[PDB]
Design a protein around this ligand. Sequence first.
Ligand SMILES: [Zn+2]
Ligand SMILES: [Zn+2]
Ligand SMILES: [Zn+2]
Ligand SMILES: [Zn+2]
Ligand SMILES: [Zn+2]
Ligand SMILES: [Zn+2]
Ligand SMILES: [Zn+2]
Lengths: 157, 158
Amino acid sequence: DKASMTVKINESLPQGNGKALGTVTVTETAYGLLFTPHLTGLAPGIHGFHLHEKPSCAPGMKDGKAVPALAAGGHLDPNKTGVHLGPYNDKGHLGDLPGLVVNADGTATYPVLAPRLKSLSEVKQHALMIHAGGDNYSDHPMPLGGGGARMACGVIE
Amino acid sequence: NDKASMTVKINESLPQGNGKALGTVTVTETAYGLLFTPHLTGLAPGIHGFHLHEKPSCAPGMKDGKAVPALAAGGHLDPNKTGVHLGPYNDKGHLGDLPGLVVNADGTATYPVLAPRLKSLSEVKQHALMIHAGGDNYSDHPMPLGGGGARMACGVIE
Ligand SMILES: [Zn+2]
Ligand SMILES: [Zn+2]
Ligand SMILES: [Zn+2]
Ligand SMILES: [Zn+2]
Ligand SMILES: [Zn+2]
Ligand SMILES: [Zn+2]
Ligand SMILES: [Zn+2]
C-alpha cells in the first residue's frame, strides 16, 4: 500500500469553479512527494505549480475586481521565509513545486518530484495551484516566479 | 551558501560521428541530489529520454554492419546490476535513469530536472549524458528502457 492520494483540479474563473480539468496524484516516495498530473485543457508549456496556504479555490476581491482562486492566499511557507525560491531550496516557500509541464495537446502527464515535502499530511488542507505563467524559482525578475494569474486550482483533502 | 557544480557540452549524435553543438547541461549538487539544468537548442519539442550511460564515449558504434549513433556509450549506468529501467525515483533500477528532458516548443531545453538518487559529481564523471529521440515512461513496459529509442545527442561528463 503506497501512501498516495488524488486531487481534483478545476478551472479558476472570476465567478468560481469552471470545468473539471482532471486530477493530480500525490505519492510518497523514498525521495519525497511525487506529483503525477492527469490534466487536460491547459496551455502548452511550463506553468507555475504551487501549494497555497488556505484550503480554498474560491475567487476573491482585489481593487474592486474579481480575482480567480484568490481565497487560497499566498504560498505555503511555515518557515516564514517570505521568499519564493523553488522546489530545491530550503530557504524559500515550502509550497514551491517544480513547474508543471504541459504537452502540446494541452495535457499534463509528466511527473514532478518535490523533494522537500515528505508525507501526505504536509499537503492536506492546502490549495494546489496552477498559474498562467511559468516559474523560474525566483522573485526576480517577476514576483513568485512569474506565475502571474491563477487559472486552475484544487483543494487537497 | 555553495555547492559543487560542473558543466557538460552536448553534441548531436549522428551515424557518422558528432553533429552540431547543441549547448550545455549544468550538473549541480543540491541537498536533494544532482540537479541537471539544460541550456540546449535544436531539439524536437517534447519530452526525451535522458540517461547516464556506462562508457565515457559518445562515439558511433558498429552493429549489424551499420553505424549506430552514440552506441559506444554502452548501456545505462547500472552499478548495482539491477538490469532494469525504473526511472529516477526508484532504487530498484538503473542508477543512470534521470527524469525526462523537457524541450520547449521552440526546440530549446531549459527546464531543470532533479535526479535524487545521485548525490555527488563523482558518481556521474566519466560517463555519457544521453538524449534520446523518444520519451521515457520510466519502465521496460510497453517498450524497453522507457521507450527512448535512438540516441540523438550526447555529451561525455568530465
Ligand atoms: Zn502560486
Ligand atoms: Zn513560492
Ligand atoms: Zn535580471
Ligand atoms: Zn557563494
Ligand atoms: Zn539511454
Ligand atoms: Zn535505465
Ligand atoms: Zn562511475
